[PDB]
Amino acid sequence: GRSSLKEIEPNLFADEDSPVHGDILEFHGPEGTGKTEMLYHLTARCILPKSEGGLEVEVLFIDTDYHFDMLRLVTILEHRLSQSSEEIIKYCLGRFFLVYCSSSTHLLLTLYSLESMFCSHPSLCLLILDSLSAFYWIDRVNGGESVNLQESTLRKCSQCLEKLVNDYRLVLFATTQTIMQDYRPYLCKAWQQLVKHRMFFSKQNQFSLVSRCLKSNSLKKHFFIIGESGVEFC
Amino acid sequence: GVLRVGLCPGLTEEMIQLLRSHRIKTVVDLVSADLEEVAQKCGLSYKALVALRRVLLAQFSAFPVNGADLYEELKTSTAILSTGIGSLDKLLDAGLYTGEVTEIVGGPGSGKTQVCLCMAANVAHGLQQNVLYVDSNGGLTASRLLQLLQAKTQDEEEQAEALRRIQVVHAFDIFQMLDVLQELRGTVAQQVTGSSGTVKVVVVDSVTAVVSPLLGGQQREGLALMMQLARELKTLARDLGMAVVVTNHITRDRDSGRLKPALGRSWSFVPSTRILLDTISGGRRMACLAKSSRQPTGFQEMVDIGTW
Amino acid sequence: KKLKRVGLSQELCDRLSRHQILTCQDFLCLSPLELMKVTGLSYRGVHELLCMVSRACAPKMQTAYGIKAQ
Amino acid sequence: QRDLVSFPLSPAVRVKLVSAGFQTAEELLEVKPSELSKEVGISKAEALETLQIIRRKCTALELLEQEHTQGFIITFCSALDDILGGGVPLMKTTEICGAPGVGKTQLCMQLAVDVQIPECFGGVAGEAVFIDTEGSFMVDRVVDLATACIQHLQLIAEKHKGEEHRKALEDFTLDNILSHIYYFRCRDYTELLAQVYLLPDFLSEHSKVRLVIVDGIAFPFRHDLDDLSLRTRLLNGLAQQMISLANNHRLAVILTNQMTTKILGESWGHAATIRLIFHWDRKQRLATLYKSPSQKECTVLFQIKPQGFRDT
Ligand SMILES: Nc1ncnc2c1ncn2[C@@H]1O[C@H](COP(=O)(O)OP(=O)(O)OP(=O)(O)O)[C@@H](O)[C@H]1O
Ligand SMILES: Nc1ncnc2c1ncn2[C@@H]1O[C@H](COP(=O)(O)OP(=O)(O)OP(=O)(O)O)[C@@H](O)[C@H]1O
Ligand SMILES: Nc1ncnc2c1ncn2[C@@H]1O[C@H](COP(=O)(O)OP(=O)(O)O)[C@@H](O)[C@H]1O
Ligand SMILES: [Mg+2]
Ligand SMILES: [Mg+2]
Ligand SMILES: [Mg+2]
């Protein structure tokens, strides 16, 4: 069975009690607004034991910014555990997987090769793609004036991501960067057509999050803080 | 990329020519193609195509690493490098971290070069580890380095030995910088087991000095070059596991009156750590964290250039 | 000063005029990357072209002895 | 692996190569220019240039020794030399800011005269390039300063009698001094950009030049309807170009700036390696070392005499 978005995070998905059968969500906003901290929060809620209030499901992290910090995640796990110890932290990290990608072509090849990974790990239900827009400018410049050439590899990546999400009832969280003057979309239409829930992050510590749900067009506002233990919703 | 003889075992000129005649030229086309349709054409064994796809995929594809293993390796391969300044070490929680990108931002004369030289001297003498200093604006001076060293020891021979552990490179444009960084990457690739030398800290003084003149007009070549430089720095930091310090300017917007880095929105995402230096005299600067993954931002304390 | 008189080829001059670049002042005020995009040449080629254009704009060297010598 | 975007290729050729599947330079190493010209739709010359482009230091102790043997340029002002660390250094950029009349041009002419002092007397024995943007350069004043310097060297030479000083003073002459100063007059921003572009070629055949002076970073008429030319110039036109010129040819670049007059762009403050502000206080001239990577900030006195720049 698969958990629901309400179970994963009951503060952002209070009205999403339906079990996930392939869901795609985007986190958008400027630098230092807590997108990666939110990813840590969800990762902790998934990989932590059921004894400590977690789901105990595996997570796959694809890092294209190279910004993943193992020490920060470890300290968050230590603070969220009632009885923190090295062995329990090691067990929690045993459900976490990390991949580094250096280019869009490299990312596409990795996505093609992850089919076996998903087949061999039935508990892997969360897929995080941090900065899907990491290679935007380089691909755009290498594509020339033809928009079809600029977006070719990202379009193929989007099709592969859709196939992966549908084939295995996964939840995909993709982080995008505010690189051009609220919300100015720039990624290929193949990616845009897939997004069901979008979230916008803002700074005031004090942080705010605006959730737009395209399934019903509902709009919501939330507030949270970040401390030594990670995210805590107000 | 392009299919070539010797790219992977099992590739022959005739097979490559048939595939190219059938509009299959790159590894991406091969892996993402319907191998049944290709196999029935060209008179090529389907199993041969399957093996070729598997080999190419296993060769050019990244693979996942379990979190526990990464924790184990980083527990021993990560180091904190004292900057030689007590207050700045207090701000940074014991100082620079290897494996990430640290940016120092400030105005003209704020103390960026002074901090870089203090760290270079402390690494060359206190740690006796090789440093690479990439000077793009003439900031580095050998007499200042020796002056900083003499405040640490009165042994002339030790001062000379420390001065021999610092490599200085001049790169006045983006292409020279990229060439120097790729040369360093290749050198580290050769000296896989090198320990006596094997520079461990890379200082890049005024990344802005080279990046800024690439931005202008409606062309996006400058953005791509800046992002390529960011990729080079990120691979030097994370892949090779060395500390990378980069100096960048500060700017203030006409409407957004706060202080911020100078290379635009895309660059703002690049550094893992950012230290802002401000002035209220010769010394008496204030330092605060403008960006971090391990601490709250906004805490400020004082540093004195004159003393250190 | 028009770019045809500097010594540039007719094809390149037309390719530049398609971007409203017609004089030495217009050419020089552009940066190397912009010129690379406009003309299709490489970096070293753009620098050779800049040197060619500036040889038609730069002043003449003099010596202080010659200045005193009237 | 080196991505093709990292090389100074032409954008069109790079796009053609990427469309043909080439991503890194290592894939273009073996292909022949003729084969490449047909694999992708480019001419033979472009293929040859592409292959050439694809195919194409000292520790701190060596630099310490180099800056020790290589001298400084004195200005005959003891306090200014002391705060500067010996004199105007080589392989660096020095900006002299201040309001008009402080004496920025007099120091430039004094350094032009002083870069020719023979090595046996502690000089560098070099020649000067003077790029004048304002037209303030005067030759008779240079004659006065050269005569004063020759008198000073003659006065010192008496102590050593017939040593190398005698032979050195023979070459050091007014006419030989004036024949080693190369003067350029840039009337506008276009000419300044052109001459800055052409300087390396001039220096490659004048290897005895050790000092380059740009008297005027922004033109004096101001009210710049040509603001675009100023923007393009100060954009790397005199930050990277002059630092590279100073380092490759081992000389000293001195820039004069009228805009900054008190203790021209937010990025232009980071350009010059050293910044000296000349300002009046109590109706007397003072020099402040506003920025420097090797000397702490300090203020000293100076004055101008018929013999040139001198202490108070
Ligand atoms: N231990 C801590 N205690 C309190 N606040 C913290 C702590 N660690 C981090 N923070 C705060 O949490 C913020 C996390 O934001 P973060 O940098 O992860 O955002 P982001 O959206 O992922 O950014 P980017 O796009 O630049 O990668 C940090 O900027 C800092 O403000
Ligand atoms: N030997 C010294 N002793 C004490 N203080 C010094 C010494 N040398 C320089 N300083 C101080 O350090 C300042 C120089 O700072 P620094 O070179 O780090 O500037 P910066 O912010 O990096 O500049 P830029 O961005 O233009 O390169 C000098 O103005 C002076 O205040
Ligand atoms: N023969 C001389 N004797 C003494 N002082 C002089 C002589 N000639 C010029 N001066 C002084 O030197 C100053 C030179 O200023 P100048 O070099 O033009 O400054 P800036 O370069 O900042 O405009 C003048 O203000 C003048 O008073
Ligand atoms: Mg983040
Ligand atoms: Mg500096
Ligand atoms: Mg003057």
Numbering used by the authors:
A (entry chain D): 20 to 200, 222 to 244, 251 to 280
B (entry chain C): 2 to 281, 287 to 314
C (entry chain A): 4 to 73
D (entry chain B): 11 to 66, 84 to 290, 301 to 349
Question: What did the published study say regarding this structure?
Answer:
BCDX2 was purified to homogeneity following expression in baculovirus-infected insect cells, and high-resolution structures were obtained in the presence of transition and ground state analogs of ATP, ADP.AlFx (2.2 Å) and ADP.BeFx (3.4 Å). In atomic models, the three NTDs of RAD51B, RAD51C and RAD51D, and three out of the four C-terminal RecA-like folds (RAD51C, RAD51D and XRCC2) were observed. The BCDX2 atomic model revealed striking similarities between the arrangement of the RecA-like domains in RAD51C-RAD51D-XRCC2 and three RAD51 protomers assembled in a nucleoprotein filament, by the stacking of the RecA-like folds and nucleotides bridging subunit interfaces. For the cryo-EM analyses, BCDX2 was vitrified in the presence of ADP.AlFx or ADP.BeFx. However, we did not observe density for AlFx or BeFx in either cryo-EM map, and instead observed that RAD51D and XRCC2 bound ATP whereas RAD51C bound ADP. The ATP remained bound to BCDX2 during protein purification. RAD51D’s key coordination points with ATP included hydrogen bonding of Walker A K113 with β- and γ-phosphates, and Walker A T114 and Walker B D206 residues (the latter via an ordered water molecule) interacting with a Mg2+ ion bridging the β- and γ-phosphates. XRCC2 binds ATP in a near-identical arrangement via Walker A K54/T55 and Walker B D149. In contrast, RAD51C bound ADP through Walker A K131, T132 and Walker B D242 residues. We therefore suggest that the Alphafold2 predicted structure corresponds to the active intermediate during the ATP hydrolytic cycle, whereas the cryo-EM structures represent the ground state of BCDX2.
